[PDB]
Amino acid sequence: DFEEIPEEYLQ
Amino acid sequence: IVEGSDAEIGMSPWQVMLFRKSPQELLCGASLISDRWVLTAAHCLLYPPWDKNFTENDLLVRIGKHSRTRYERNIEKISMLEKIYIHPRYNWRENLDRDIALMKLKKPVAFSDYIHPVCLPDRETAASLLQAGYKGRVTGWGNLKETGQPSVLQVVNLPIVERPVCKDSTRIRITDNMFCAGYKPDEGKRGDACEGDSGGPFVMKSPFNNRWYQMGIVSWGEGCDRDGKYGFYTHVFRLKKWIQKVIDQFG
Amino acid sequence: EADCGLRPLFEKKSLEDKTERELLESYI
Ligand SMILES: N[C@H](Cc1ccccc1)C(=O)N1CCC[C@H]1C(=O)NCCc1c[nH]cn1
Ligand SMILES: *[C@@H]1O[C@H](CO)[C@@H](O)[C@H](O)[C@H]1NC(C)=O
Ligand code: NA
Ligand code: NA
What we know:
Chain B: This is Thrombin heavy chain. Chain A is largely without helices or strands and about 10 residues long.
């Protein structure tokens, strides 16, 4: 449902 | 938010979205109270009846948002959490008494046209504004109906309700750490917070100094926008000594 | 902070949002 967020915030 | 409307751009620049990393989904609302501190409801982070007990690394905070689902490039800012603090006397077993939590961000967020902190009330502002009939404003990305979800942040204005009416509307035990808001059946107008709006702010604009103050936190309700029921909010001023203690010792 | 509660796109520019007057009118 949500647009993917940048990978930098999930690392 | 049931029976609200789309927020204007920049209308609630203290609004925060609590976001689960995996699966990626909205968890709750919250509010920005300084460049490093976010205020929310404790049940957004800890609610054992629903097997909820989040740790810092489970979560992100998204600030400056308007769209619910879009990644708002160049506008929103996403922050990691350094530490969660839940009120030590938060009562998740019975009635959500003291439903309040603080989150410290790993790094300060930069303020902008879309990102700006709300004030917390002093005793005098609370005494002056927390009166039956006086209206505040609730905002969130939660459900549009009890039984879908909005494209953008929703906002509704609601009146504070007399404490005997709040108490007489429910079998749940109400405490001095709560207040209720919403229209009565005979008033015609409608509106409420709902699931997904948890932790979002109930704000009032002081007519004395023209600043917005966060008087409440979306805490609980029986259904959403039901006639004769009201929404219940954590009484921020009553718990401000704890807020100040946390920030002074962990800031 | 010292600037809390004053919105960049509203109070800081002396612009009102479309429903804040409803709040003021209730502060009776
Ligand atoms: N419906 C419960 C009632 C309840 C109250 C106190 C203790 C336990 C349960 C209830 O409200 N909860 C369950 C835990 C989280 C909380 C909740 O959903 N809050 C979101 C705001 C809302 C929901 N609906 C209308 N505003
Ligand atoms: C919540 O989780 C933490 C660590 O995951 C644990 O120490 C604590 O006992 C848990 N609290 C409850 C009420 O289950
Ligand atoms: Na009762
Ligand atoms: Na109602």
